[PDB]
Symmetry: D2
Subunit: 264 residues, 4 copies
């Protein structure tokens, strides 16, 4: 099987990568970072996020695996001391695949424009180019609210433990095909009104943000953050595409949440 | 078709009920409150909740409809001025059914006990008999947290706009088969830790609350509130059963939320 | 100096108490639990709260000191291993007094009634006798809001780290003469509106709760919880009375908060 | 008395300004925008904020008054229809002054640097230059927390109804000499910990933010927002300076809050 390994790039991660490559050299098992079937990430969630975005045009063909050199691995699965066991198990094909939902973001411009389309594993957020942030929120073509505040965050299920959590969003099991919209510092008074609460949308629901003033927005997709000018619409929906993980052993999502927030 | 009508019991609702009965007398269309196929509720959500609990052993056989004499009808569908049109449409069978998920609550006791089982359309909550409230939260047999605070609330999707909302929970579209757990005044310090965030569980996930001290709890199921003694376990899961609504015309959930919280 | 010692009542606290009494026997320093000038509490904050309420008619004459046998001493000052040093320092009168604000609660009834008056070190809360909870909130005689929800909590500055904190209230330095009002699960929709936010009131401001329906309320004052019937008014204001602590050494409030919530 | 009038600059505000000037021409009462004793602002709170910052070196000599051409006047006092009555009352000197606390912000740099000092009527906030935001929070020289998240907001009492409110802060009566610190999207997990809660500081307490990485910050002071490079420290304290308002008639702060958030 073709595989590749991304590293965080510190001494620890590089040496671990070299050892795994040497270990894989005893099997079959070819290193290929153009068309890999397995992508191993060694580092933290940031490294894992970069690996995902490196290969987003090949998601249907790849199973991802993370080794964490932290603290903190929501997309790890593995400790560095377990790397030899992982080489062994991965070479023997002793694994069942697990899929998580992804978020599609479409950014439509004026003139042309595009139509830029992005895929997120954690979330996409929108803020002003600074700038009061004011947008009309449209759900399946019905005007829902005029949002005023700092910005909005649209999260995948696996993303709910990240930025979503800090904003008061719910944690959602990744078997649920949904996206969740949270507010950043909404303004609520006698004249300005928002829902307040996070909103959880099923597949096929479309959430559209339309400028009120002010057509310039800072848009993030996971780690990536870009200033978009002359925006006519930002559009969110659950992607038809999914990320596939290689597992290996039981490590339930709720235990992962327990280990990350309660105690380990 | 067999039908019945529950009324809130004020002059407005009773007279509306009598007129609808008279209107149904011109069709076929028999009044039967033992084995109805259609249950019409005239009042508010409280009246609707009582109608549901009146007929919870016949949920597979009944389509529910609500007329609101409020303000505030999340389970209405209809205004009193539209009652004649509703009589007409309901008699002609001009409707498609919509189903919403329900919550199963199991309360297990010591000695015997039971095993009391309840069905909720909005939510089930647990508080102490007063009493510090302390429970172990167990998700699919793994210990997740020791919760200390005022209590816990487990909501259906349609329930998310009710008690769940007041506690900071997410609003969830009712096409999603899930339940949501929210905290009431959790204690968080260096020694006591809870997740903080609401938690959204898919079908087949089981959330179990187990007493730490203190085996006496005040348990609510929608409007019903009962003191249970000598509790060994409280168990939550998405019910296999569903409530069926008769519709009639498009009134999307998100528009219902808009009309109820933003403006109408 | 006259002193007394309350104990939590477990083996640890009782023996510590006996040793301190023996230690005080070597000074002057008379044990008197009728008219003490120093009240030592050995246990947790619960023990300390009971000691305070034991002597609330003598607050102007007493300096309080807490030794914690926890984890968790917001009203401790002292570890059990330091008890000998404390005996020594307290006998020599090597201490400056620190005062914290208190909360006055007045409960007015119908017929008669009373006028029951309570003093709180942490907070007073109000909930329904169960029961939807609905009250009119009146600030300095102006109608501010109709509150619907689970209840309300009025906290002292030192109380802000307790129930207040769990409800989303601000932590306030105890040098500020104020009280803070927080909501429990407020209902907010198109027809029902509350402020949402915690409210911080200075000295001489009066907050009055007046029944809308329903004149029966469960009222807590620190650990004490009582069902009051036929209530006409519940009235809150910063007390003219203060609790005095004996200190001893610098242990700033913010460090106390750090040690209790961040790390120790 | 010397006075000046700032206008929002739309037709409505300019004409109102011209009429008030004409009205003041019948008294004594000289227009002077260099050394005014009365500053009238016609517009919204933004206009009022600009008027304040226009004259921040003369705060001890000026009484401010606002007329609102909104909706929304927390620093208005007056409707446009009342402008004639205001001209009359202001000319006769029929007013008592009211003072509100202000926030001092000190920004210290490396090399030199400065020491930039700012005065805020609403708040000062800090965010990264984008950028993960990580700062050490130091209260009166004791390390309190390492904050990770979007940013921090330090509010005056009158500022608590603004940005502070959106971030979950308490509303504080402006007779209380304090500042309030709120979090923007704090990260809390097993390894990263913040207090969560808003913090209310008395006069003479000093809150210092010290960079961990990353010495570049976007700092706001009311409407003003500036990118500061090579920051060594950001320092907050309640200013010795106060804003003085001219009043005129009773319009209590809590009624102002009611009118702005509940109903008018
Ligand atoms: N999925 C997930 N769950 C929990 N924690 C995560 C996750 N993904 C990344 N992280 C953690 O984010 C940290 C930096 S990853 S860089 C990009 C991510 O940063 C996250 N981010 C950005 N601002 C915030 C704030 N303010 N709060 C929480 N998370 C934030 C956002 O989700 C982005 O996708 C690091 O501690 C990771 O362990
Ligand atoms: N599904 C739904 N959404 C929104 N609002 C609802 C819903 N069901 C009922 N209600 C409203 O609850 C009010 C009384 S119904 S009696 C039983 C329900 O009360 C609700 N309850 C109890 N305490 C609270 C609090 N504290 N906050 C919000 N809701 C609460 C809970 O969901 C129970 O199921 C009335 O205004 C109804 O319009
Ligand atoms: N002042 C203060 N700060 C922090 N923690 C405190 C304080 N006073 C007591 N406690 C802690 O409350 C716990 C039980 S004391 S019994 C009475 C107090 O319970 C508190 N209480 C009741 N329900 C709650 C909830 N739901 N959350 C937080 N605190 C609560 C309330 O403040 C009462 O005054 C124990 O861990 C103490 O260390
Ligand atoms: N003091 C006060 N209370 C309530 N509302 C206020 C106040 N001052 C200004 N405003 C309102 O802020 C709006 C724009 S003023 S421009 C500068 C202020 O914007 C405020 N701001 C910036 N971002 C936010 C967010 N996200 N939420 C609330 N307020 C925000 C912040 O307090 C700044 O001082 C307008 O509706 C004013 O009526």
């Amino acid at each position: 099987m073709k595989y590749m390994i991304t590293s965080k790039g510190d001494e620890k991660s590089d040496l671990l990568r070299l050892n795994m490559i040497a270990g894989f050299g005893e099997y079959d098992m070819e290193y290929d970072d153009v068309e890999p079937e397995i992508v191993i990430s060694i580092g933290g969630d940031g490294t894992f996020l970069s690996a995902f975005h490196q290969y987003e045009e090949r998601l249907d063909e790849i199973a991802f695996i993370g080794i964490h050199t932290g603290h903190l691995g929501f997309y790890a699965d593995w400790r560095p001391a377990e790397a030899d066991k992982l080489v062994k198990l991965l070479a023997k094909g002793e694994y069942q695949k697990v899929s998580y939902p992804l978020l599609k973001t479409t950014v439509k411009y004026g003139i042309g424009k595009k139509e830029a389309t992005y895929l997120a594993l954690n979330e996409s957020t929108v803020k002003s180019s600074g700038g009061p942030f004011v947008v009309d929120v449209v759900i399946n073509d019905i005007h829902f609210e005029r949002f005023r505040g700092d910005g909005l965050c649209m999260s995948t299920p696996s993303g709910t433990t990240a930025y979503n959590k800090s904003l008061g969003g719910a944690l959602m099991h990744p078997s649920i095909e949904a996206m969740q919209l949270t507010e950043m510092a909404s303004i609520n008074n006698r004249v300005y009104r928002t829902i307040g609460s996070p909103l959880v949308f099923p597949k096929h629901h479309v959430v559209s943000l339309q400028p009120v003033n002010d057509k310039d927005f800072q848009i993030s997709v996971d780690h990536l953050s870009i200033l978009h000018r002359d925006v006519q619409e930002i559009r969110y929906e659950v992607s038809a595409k999914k990320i596939h993980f290689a597992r290996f052993r039981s490590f339930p999502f709720w235990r992962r949440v327990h280990d990350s927030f309660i105690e380990d």
